[PDB]
Design an enzyme around this catalytic site. Structure first.
Site, PDB file in Angstrom:
ATOM      1  N   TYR A 240      29.727  76.094  25.924  1.00  0.00           N
ATOM      2  CA  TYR A 240      28.676  76.801  26.642  1.00  0.00           C
ATOM      3  C   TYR A 240      27.460  76.951  25.758  1.00  0.00           C
ATOM      4  O   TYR A 240      27.586  77.292  24.582  1.00  0.00           O
ATOM      5  CB  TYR A 240      29.230  78.184  26.998  1.00  0.00           C
ATOM      6  CG  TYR A 240      28.257  79.110  27.671  1.00  0.00           C
ATOM      7  CD1 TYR A 240      27.954  78.960  29.023  1.00  0.00           C
ATOM      8  CD2 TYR A 240      27.642  80.137  26.954  1.00  0.00           C
ATOM      9  CE1 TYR A 240      27.054  79.809  29.648  1.00  0.00           C
ATOM     10  CE2 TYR A 240      26.738  80.993  27.568  1.00  0.00           C
ATOM     11  CZ  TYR A 240      26.452  80.816  28.910  1.00  0.00           C
ATOM     12  OH  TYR A 240      25.530  81.617  29.507  1.00  0.00           O
TER      13      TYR A 240
ATOM     14  N   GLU B 141      21.196  76.183  31.174  1.00  0.00           N
ATOM     15  CA  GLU B 141      22.483  76.733  30.768  1.00  0.00           C
ATOM     16  C   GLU B 141      23.422  75.565  31.003  1.00  0.00           C
ATOM     17  O   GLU B 141      23.467  75.012  32.101  1.00  0.00           O
ATOM     18  CB  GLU B 141      22.849  77.920  31.674  1.00  0.00           C
ATOM     19  CG  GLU B 141      24.136  78.663  31.322  1.00  0.00           C
ATOM     20  CD  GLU B 141      24.464  79.742  32.355  1.00  0.00           C
ATOM     21  OE1 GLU B 141      24.226  79.508  33.550  1.00  0.00           O
ATOM     22  OE2 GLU B 141      24.949  80.827  31.990  1.00  0.00           O
TER      23      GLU B 141
ATOM     24  N   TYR C 261      27.313  73.422  30.387  1.00  0.00           N
ATOM     25  CA  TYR C 261      28.755  73.593  30.293  1.00  0.00           C
ATOM     26  C   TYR C 261      29.555  72.300  30.129  1.00  0.00           C
ATOM     27  O   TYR C 261      29.181  71.274  30.664  1.00  0.00           O
ATOM     28  CB  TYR C 261      29.262  74.160  31.631  1.00  0.00           C
ATOM     29  CG  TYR C 261      28.904  75.574  31.969  1.00  0.00           C
ATOM     30  CD1 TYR C 261      27.730  75.865  32.667  1.00  0.00           C
ATOM     31  CD2 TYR C 261      29.777  76.609  31.673  1.00  0.00           C
ATOM     32  CE1 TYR C 261      27.446  77.156  33.063  1.00  0.00           C
ATOM     33  CE2 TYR C 261      29.515  77.893  32.057  1.00  0.00           C
ATOM     34  CZ  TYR C 261      28.340  78.168  32.761  1.00  0.00           C
ATOM     35  OH  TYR C 261      28.094  79.464  33.153  1.00  0.00           O
TER      36      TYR C 261
END
Length: 185
Positions: A69, A78, A80
């Site tokens: 992350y 963001e 992942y």
């Protein structure tokens, strides 16, 4: 490598008992939570990093992700790399697949609206995801060759920002309960 960053964020809901252990080890016991993200890693992420981890305990009782992350700024993204999950496999707009570290991952993009970001407050931002097609077994020494994902994302027009923020091997949960114990290096 030694980790130098400890990530322990919660929106305040329920119980999140996060333990900053020795070295790259951490554990989390959580119950009836809102959203939280706990993990260890590096203060400044890198597109060239190779992350190693061993999840001795991966026991989510609901929605939870065992995932690399991180964030970039300019633009705000963001990202992942999900190796395992609980009851819900995260998905979004399908872009393609990539094989990295023995597993096959689907690549997705999603957008968050008026959601809390790294800077605090709320805003709208894009999320980049590589989600394993099947859960990676835990309890073993695993590797996530981040360059493999970054290059695949780039081939699909998913370019990361120029200002790198933290990068950690995390446990994220959403309205669930569970336990995890992970060592990162």
């Amino acid at each position: 490598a030694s980790t130098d960053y400890w990530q322990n964020w919660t929106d305040g809901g329920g119980i999140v008992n996060a333990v900053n252990g020795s070295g790259g080890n951490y554990s989390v016991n959580w119950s009836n939570t809102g959203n939280f993200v706990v993990g260890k890693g590096w203060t400044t992420g890198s597109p060239f990093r190779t992350i190693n981890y061993n999840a001795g305990v991966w026991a989510p009782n609901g929605n939870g992700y065992l995932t690399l992350y991180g964030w970039t700024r300019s633009p705000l993204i963001e990202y992942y790399v999900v190796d395992s999950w609980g009851t819900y496999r995260p998905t979004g707009t399908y872009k393609g697949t990539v094989k990295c570290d023995g597993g096959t991952y689907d690549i997705y993009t999603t957008t968050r609206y008026n959601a809390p970001s790294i800077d605090g407050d709320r805003t709208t931002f894009t999320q980049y995801w590589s989600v394993r097609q099947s859960k990676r077994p835990t309890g073993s020494n695993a590797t996530i060759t981040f360059t493999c994902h970054v290059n695949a994302w780039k081939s699909h027009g998913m370019n990361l920002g120029s200002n790198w923020a933290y990068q950690v091997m995390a446990t994220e949960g959403y309205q669930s309960s569970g336990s995890s114990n992970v060592t990162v290096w």
